[PDB]
Write a protein that binds this ligand. Structure first.
Ligand SMILES: *[C@@H]1O[C@H](CO)[C@@H](O[C@@H]2O[C@H](CO)[C@@H](O)[C@H](O)[C@H]2NC(C)=O)[C@H](O)[C@H]1NC(C)=O
Ligand SMILES: *[C@@H]1O[C@H](CO)[C@@H](O[C@@H]2O[C@H](CO)[C@@H](O)[C@H](O)[C@H]2NC(C)=O)[C@H](O)[C@H]1NC(C)=O
Ligand SMILES: *[C@@H]1O[C@H](CO)[C@@H](O)[C@H](O)[C@H]1NC(C)=O
Length: 621
């Protein structure tokens, strides 16, 4: 049925901490993993800053504002936390205009001690850490210079004087662009692309007539203006610029743009905006070389170059993505693919639901999910779809049933098999979070009035129980939990006011007495992913192979632990003509998978899809 006597267990595991300060903004950062360190930066308007630190996963805080000498901190930059468990933090201060250069506070003890240094310049962007080493930092000044440091901020040196974009690469390699005359705004389309693998000792130009560049996966993209027109194309290199090749994508005008929806180690999603202010574009998918692209989804919804898109990578299950499209009648609709872009289809309606006013036929409708685009329209959608790699097949999102995204108050839906089937979880907008690799899910109401109740479920979203965690209702502001969905601590943030006495508060609840017992070998059951028809001999193998998981049973209340790794067992299907895509100068006509040439590189005509692992069968080569 359900667990009982939970109120007593949770009574002793609730801790309240009240922050005494002026209520301005709040910025929360996690330092490292498994350390439990958190930093809170309160900024307000002269201006003042307060800095708080914890070592207890947010249960207790201490005021370390005296370590930064009570200096004001630019919140626009925020905090520059180092990679991995480096325990490095950098804060940029505000200094008088007459000063020659800026000023930073830098630590390497997980914020236990800070050291003050004066830079010889005025930073224009945020410091960037090298992925390979955390002692390397670069930044651009206000005069468009490029300064690098090999000492973690101790000493800086200038390596170029007219840069306008720089980013790190693998093996401490720096790519940047420089403008010869004027400014990168005025000199756009005539830039250069340089590289230096020695941190400023030698340079090698790897591009001319550049318009922009970007890094994704193991590819390097650069947009180059045409010789005699404003149209620009794309070039891709896998050698860090030693050799280039031209991608097989249509050119764009001056008002259009490109966009890397998602890049992988063996694949990239690309968006190409159609001419005019139509508001939609197209999605292309590449091969493992990043050269040949095939049309994937038409009328993809993309607001503008700095706009919003609903594209989402469902990380719970393999090769599943969700996005929004614009229908012929100008109604926003949602699509889902399970083949990694091979095909797209509408979401399946919940088994027991009724279509809303949007639907024309009450016996025919589908689910539609609110996302970042709906948030951009000032609607009652507090969050976006949520999924974790270590929680298998669990997806939570706000949605409404109908023939298009409705403009009424949404509900919350959950899918326990990657997105094949959905069911209604809760009524009305909520804030949700996954704890302990799917062992517990918590929900908080999203209302305009004070709330003093939290709901949790151990059946993986089937039955819920309420717990009253405070006597004085607060105005909820947001939840906080350690990244990775592997902890059992949840922090609730909010403020309570009576008469000008608003004051931040937070509550931290520990579920260690609910999941008392450790999961055994008898609490896990075998599960087959991507299953559609059990009778079929080859059922459930997507992209050439199938996998079986061991998932915790919904009727077991146990703790997975922080050292949980998902069990798995791939099995390989056979190869068919559906596992290959046409290559270069070929196309695939309608109602057949054959590749026929259009009525120096040369191939047979077929190219295996990136990620396929099929063996034997039919090899059209
Ligand atoms: C979508 O998310 C999934 C899950 O995080 C990504 O799969 C991982 O990809 C990394 C490399 O980026 C691999 O090292 C991991 O082994 C993958 N994890 C798995 C399969 O559980 C996937 O790459 C993402 N897709 C895109 C296009 O970025
Ligand atoms: C939830 O927070 C508590 C805060 O006490 C964590 O307990 C600490 O965990 C760290 C892990 O590095 C241990 O070194 C400490 O000794 C623990 N403190 C105490 C007082 O026991 C706890 O680990 C967190 N829970 C989860 C699941 O991560
Ligand atoms: C803090 O700043 C003041 C500014 O007057 C300065 O005199 C003082 O030396 C600083 N303290 C430390 C420990 O650097």
């Amino acid at each position: 049925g359900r667990v009982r006597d939970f109120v007593a267990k949770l009574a002793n595991n609730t801790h309240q901490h009240v922050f005494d300060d002026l209520r301005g903004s709040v910025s929360l950062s996690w330092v490292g993993d498994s350390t439990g360190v958190i930093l809170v930066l309160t900024t307000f308007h002269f201006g003042q800053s307060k800095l708080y630190r914890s070592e207890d996963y947010g249960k207790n805080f201490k005021d370390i504002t005296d370590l930064i000498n009570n200096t004001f901190i630019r919140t626009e930059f925020g905090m520059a936390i180092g990679p991995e468990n480096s325990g490095k933090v950098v804060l940029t201060a505000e200094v008088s205009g007459g000063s020659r250069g800026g000023r930073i506070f830098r630590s390497s003890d997980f914020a236990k001690n800070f050291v003050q240094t004066d830079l010889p310049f005025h930073p224009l962007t945020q410091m960037m850490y090298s992925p390979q080493n955390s002692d390397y930092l670069l930044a651009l000044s206000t005069e468009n210079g490029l300064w690098v440091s090999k000492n973690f901020g101790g000493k800086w040196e200038e390596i170029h004087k007219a840069v306008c974009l720089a980013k790190w690469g693998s093996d401490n390699t720096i790519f940047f662009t420089t403008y010869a005359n004027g400014s990168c705004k005025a000199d756009l389309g005539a830039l250069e692309l340089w590289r230096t693998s020695d941190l400023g000792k030698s340079f090698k130009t790897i591009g001319v007539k550049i318009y922009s560049f970007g890094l994704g996966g193991r590819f390097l993209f650069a947009s180059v203006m045409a010789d005699k027109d404003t149209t620009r194309r794309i070039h891709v290199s896998t050698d860090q610029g030693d050799t280039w090749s031209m991608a097989q994508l249509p050119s764009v005008g001056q008002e259009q743009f490109y966009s890397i929806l998602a890049a992988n180690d063996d694949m990239v999603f690309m968006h190409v905006d159609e001419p005019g202010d139509t508001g939609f574009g197209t999605i292309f998918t590449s091969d493992d070389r990043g050269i040949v692209y095939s049309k994937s989804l038409d009328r993809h919804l993309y607001t503008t170059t700095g706009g919003e898109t609903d594209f989402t990578n469902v990380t719970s299950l393999r090769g599943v993505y969700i996005t929004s499209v614009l229908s012929e009648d100008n109604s926003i609709q949602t699509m889902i693919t399970f083949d990694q872009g091979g095909r797209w289809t509408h979401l399946r309606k919940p088994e027991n639901s009724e279509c809303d006013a949007t639907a024309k036929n009450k016996n025919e409708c589908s689910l539609h999910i609110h996302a970042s685009y709906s948030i951009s329209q000032k609607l009652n959608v507090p969050m976006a779809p949520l999924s974790e790699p270590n929680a298998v097949g669990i997806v939570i999102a706000h949605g409404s049933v109908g023939d298009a995204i409705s403009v009424m108050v949404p509900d919350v839906y959950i899918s326990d098999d990657g997105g094949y089937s959905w069911t209604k979880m809760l009524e009305g907008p909520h804030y949700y979070t996954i704890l302990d690799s799917g062992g517990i899910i918590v929900a908080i109401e999203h209302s305009s009035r004070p709330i003093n109740v939290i709901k949790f479920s151990t059946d993986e979203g089937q039955c819920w129980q309420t717990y009253t965690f405070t006597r004085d209702p607060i105005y909820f502001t947001g939840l906080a939990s350690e990244p990775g969905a592997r902890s059992m601590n949840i922090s609730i943030w909010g403020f309570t006011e009576s008469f000008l006495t608003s004051q931040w508060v937070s509550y931290t609840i520990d579920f260690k007495d609910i999941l008392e017992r450790n999961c055994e070998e008898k609490d896990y059951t075998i599960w087959l992913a991507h299953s559609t028809d059990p009778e079929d001999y080859e059922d459930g193998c997507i992209l050439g192979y199938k996998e079986q998981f061991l998932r915790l049973r919904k009727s077991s209340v146990c703790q997975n632990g922080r050292d949980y790794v998902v069990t798995k067992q791939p099995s390989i299907c056979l190869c068919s003509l559906e596992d290959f895509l046409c290559d270069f100068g070929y196309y695939r006509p309608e109602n057949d998978s054959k590749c026929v040439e259009q009525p120096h590189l040369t191939t047979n005509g077929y190219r295996k899809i990136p990620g396929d692992k099929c063996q034997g069968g039919v090899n059209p080569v």
